[PDB]
């Protein structure tokens, strides 16, 4: 159901838990 | 019903943080913004905002009931939210939404025609042959009623007569007429087609339903069908698996020469 990555994919992943979201002023 | 720009000038559909920041930095001005649906937490959204000193901030937007919530504040629509932080209150201290960044929408500026009849060229001339339904790019029209064109299915280039073609609307996707492209079928039908009519290593490409400007390459292995995301850059290229290409046709050639899945190459598009 998800997109797949090809065999030669060069995407270096980043963890969602490290992504910082912010709040408006 | 809001002071926001039209949605298609700032809504990117489903999009991850990396591509969103790439698009905002390509835009380049402080105050540039877009809204996306979270790729990792679907059903929730993100306002991505280019601030000073090349920093991009991302604000989560929660869809609760029929409304959208950000910082605990309620908005009837994403447009109302954008209007609010463009013209009513600041988003960060001393900063407001200023420049909407549009998703890379595919446009074809060249004239296109469609064959209403098949045609067999006269041999050893500049004419080209074609099938009913073939689409053409028109490069120029001569006063003999003839046109110098490229046939999108075959990529042959040459003369055809206007009496055998009709005009094509500017709205059709630029890949219409390519043998591997299906611009009207649904996701479900692409799966069904590859299972019934397609063979192993058959493939097709269609536009994404969830990300304006994206395309999906459907590929059939021995056991299942896999979908790969093709994403345009703001620089007239396409990205798949972190690799960059001048055209989707180039992606197809690449994966005819390199394995797309371990033990598989692209063979032939599913007939259309």
Tokens encoding B250: 């180039």
- Pairing type for strands B215-220 and B135-141 reads unpaired
- Other CB atoms within a 10 A radius of the CB of residue A5 amount to 17
Segments in chain B forming alpha helices (H): 17-27, 78-87, 187-196, 248-257
> Entry resolution in angstroms?
2.0
B-chain residue closest to A20, CA distance: B58
Residue B107, number of CB atoms within 10 A of its CB: 9
Cβ of residue A15 closer than 8 Å to a chain B Cβ: no
Tell me the two tokens of residue B63.
Answer: 């869809």
CATH code linked to domain B112-167: 2.30.30.40
Contacts of A8 in chain B (CB under 8 A): 241, 243, 258-259
> Helices (DSSP H) in B182-247: which residue ranges?
187-196
**Smallest Cα–Cα separation from B207: which of B236, B234, B235, B178?**
B178
Dist. CA B158–CA B26, nearest whole Å: 38
Domain boundaries B7-100, corresponding CATH code: 3.30.505.10
Which one of B91, B255, B259 has the shortest CB-CB distance to A24? B91
Sequence-separated (6 or more) residues with CB below 8 Å from residue B251: B217, B230, B238, B240, B245
- Chain A residues within 8 A of B46 when measuring between CB atoms: 21
User: Where are any strands of DSSP class E within B65-214?
Assistant: 67-70, 73-75, 99-100, 111-115, 135-141, 146-151, 157-161, 165-167, 203-207
> Tokens for B61?
């937007």
């Amino acid at each position: 159901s998800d997109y797949a990555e090809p065999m030669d994919a060069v995407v270096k992943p980043r963890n969602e838990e490290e992504n910082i979201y912010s709040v408006p002023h | 019903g809001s002071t926001a720009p039209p949605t298609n000038q700032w809504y990117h559909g489903k999009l991850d943080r990396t591509i969103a920041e790439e698009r905002l930095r390509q835009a380049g001005k402080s105050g540039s913004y877009l809204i996306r649906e979270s790729d990792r937490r679907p059903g929730s959204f993100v306002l991505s905002f280019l601030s000073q000193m090349n920093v991009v901030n991302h604000f989560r937007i929660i869809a609760m009931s029929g409304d959208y919530y950000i910082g605990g504040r309620r908005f009837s629509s994403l447009s109302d939210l954008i209007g609010y932080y463009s013209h009513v209150s600041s988003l960060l201290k001393g900063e407001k939404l200023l420049y909407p960044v549009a998703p890379p929408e595919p446009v074809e500026d060249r004239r296109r025609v469609r064959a209403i009849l098949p045609y067999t060229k006269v041999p050893d001339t500049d004419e080209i042959s074609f099938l009913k339904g073939d689409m053409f790019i028109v490069h120029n029209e001569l006063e003999d009623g003839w046109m110098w064109v490229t046939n999108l299915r075959t990529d042959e280039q040459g003369l055809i007569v206007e009496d055998l073609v009709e005009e094509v609307g500017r709205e059709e996707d630029p890949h219409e007429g390519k043998i591997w492209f299906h611009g009207k079928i649904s996701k479900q039908e692409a799966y069904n087609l590859l299972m019934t009519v397609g063979q192993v290593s058959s493939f097709l490409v269609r536009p994404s339903d969830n990300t304006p400007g994206d395309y999906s390459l459907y590929f059939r292995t021995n056991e299942n069908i896999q979908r790969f995301k093709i994403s345009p850059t703001p620089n007239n290229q396409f990205m798949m698996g972190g690799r960059y290409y001048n055209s989707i046709g180039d992606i197809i050639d690449h994966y005819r020469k390199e394995q797309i899945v371990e033990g598989y190459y692209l063979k032939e598009p599913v007939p259309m």
